[PDB]
């Protein structure tokens, strides 16, 4: 069963931080124009942080000081390299940065 | 397709780096072939994360890397001996597929003098 | 490590004959997810290996149905009914259920 990635719509005023919770290497992805994958961070650009909670299975994926260009689509995925190449991806969530 | 680099002619004790360009999510595997030892799985890299898993028999002998801004994977062979003279294939495994190696490179031959 | 042992090194045939290639694994090869990643590859002379059968018995896309795979536990078999010239080469079994992945030593199907 894949990880969850919530909230599905994250409404944040620009300048505030935004944190998704990924509950499941663990990658945080942003879907670009041309709908291709960009890796923002991994567990284990300074504005995209991943914090493993004491829970161990939950992770906070945070945008520090969200800008309007940060608006887009995001997800998390867990990769197992072997035996058998496997990825379990979350459903896609949207970051909606609004004007202050 | 997987396009492999040209034949290598190298001396004992040296190192050589082979490349594999993916044309046209996956993991990239390397396989050695010799008449006496057959086909041997060397290891795998996931280019997106850089993660690797090695066959312990090839730890130290082979180092797998992959570029981030080109679809190229590499295998560096070190401490070369006549036992390393062989054909080396790169092959691909799709994420979340039911099978392994449906696409293979043509192989790169290494000859240790 | 799992050792994959093929029963015969060579099989001399005539075109149109039946061929059977068997492979014994030293341990069972069921992945933790329940699938058995037992595969058969054909390496035609001077070519790279090509995937014929995956998950024991499934033909890869485009592989003709004269090829069939069966087996379970530690014994797996590829059968070629009425073999054609394009079938000549070396057949290798392969397990990808447990790291490190391992291949059989090959069985060469050649003209008798």
B44 CB neighbours in chain A (<8 A) are: 81-82, 85
- Written as six digits, the tokens of A74 are 């995001």
Whole-angstrom distance, CA of residue B49 vs CA of residue B66: 9
**In 3-state terms, what secondary structure has residue B81?**
coil
DSSP A4-61: EEE-SEEEEETTS-EEEEEE--EEEEEE-TTS-EEEEEEE---SEEEEE-TTSSEEEE
List the domain range (segments joined by +) for residue A94.
1-100
At what resolution in Å was this solved?
A: 1.4
**CATH code for position A40:** 2.60.40.10
b/e C30-44 (16+ beta carbons within 10 angstroms → b): eeeeebbbbbbbbbe
Our count of domains for chain A comes to: 1
**Residue among B57, B99, B104 whose CB faces C49 most closely:** B104
Beta bridge mates, B32: B40, B88
Whole-angstrom distance, CA of residue A46 vs CA of residue A44: 14
Chain C contact for B51, CB < 8 A? no
**Residue among C51, C55, C96 whose CB faces B102 most closely:** C51
Give helix then strand counts, H and E, for chain B. 0, 11
Please tell me the experimental approach by which this structure was elucidated.
X-ray
Q: Within its chain, how far is the Cα of C96 from the centroid?
A: 13
Among candidates C92, C83, C91, which has minimal Cα distance to C111? C83
Cβ neighbors of B64 (< 8 A, separation 6 or more) are: B28, B30, B42, B43, B44, B45, B52, B54, B73, B74, B75
Are the beta carbons of C99 and A84 separated by less than 8 Å? no
């Amino acid at each position: 069963n894949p990880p969850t990635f919530s909230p599905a719509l994250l409404v944040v005023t620009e300048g505030d931080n935004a944190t998704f919770t990924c509950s499941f290497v663990l990658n945080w992805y942003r879907m670009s124009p041309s709908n291709q994958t960009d890796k923002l961070a991994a567990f284990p650009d300074c504005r995209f942080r991943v914090t493993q909670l004491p829970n161990g299975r939950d992770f906070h994926m945070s945008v520090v000081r969200a800008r309007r260009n940060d608006s887009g689509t995001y997800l998390c995925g867990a990769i197992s390299l072997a035996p058998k190449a496997q990825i379990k991806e979350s459903l896609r969530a949207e970051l909606r940065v609004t004007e202050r | 397709q997987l396009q492999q680099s040209g034949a290598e002619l190298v001396r004992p004790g040296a190192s050589v780096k082979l490349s594999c360009k993916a044309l046209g999510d996956y993991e990239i595997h390397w396989v050695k072939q010799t008449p006496v030892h057959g086909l041997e799985w060397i290891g795998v890299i996931h280019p997106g994360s850089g993660g690797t898993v090695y066959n312990q028999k090839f730890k130290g002998k082979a180092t797998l890397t992959a570029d981030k801004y080109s679809s190229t994977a590499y295998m560096e062979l070190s401490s070369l001996t006549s036992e390393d003279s062989a054909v080396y294939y790169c092959t691909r495994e799709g994420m979340n597929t039911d099978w392994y190696f449906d696409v293979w490179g043509a192989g790169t031959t290494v000859t240790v003098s | 490590d799992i050792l994959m042992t093929q029963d015969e090194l060579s099989l001399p045939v005539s075109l149109g004959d039946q061929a059977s290639i068997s492979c014994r694994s030293s341990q069972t090869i069921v992945h933790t997810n329940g699938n058995t990643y037992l595969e058969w590859y054909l390496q035609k002379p001077g070519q790279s290996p090509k995937l014929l059968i995956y998950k024991v018995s499934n033909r890869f896309s485009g592989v003709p149905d004269r090829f069939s795979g069966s087996g379970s536990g530690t014994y797996f078999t590829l059968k070629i009914s009425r073999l054609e010239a394009e079938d000549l080469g070396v057949y290798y079994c392969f397990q990808g259920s447990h790291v490190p992945y391992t291949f059989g030593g090959g069985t060469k199907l050649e003209m008798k």
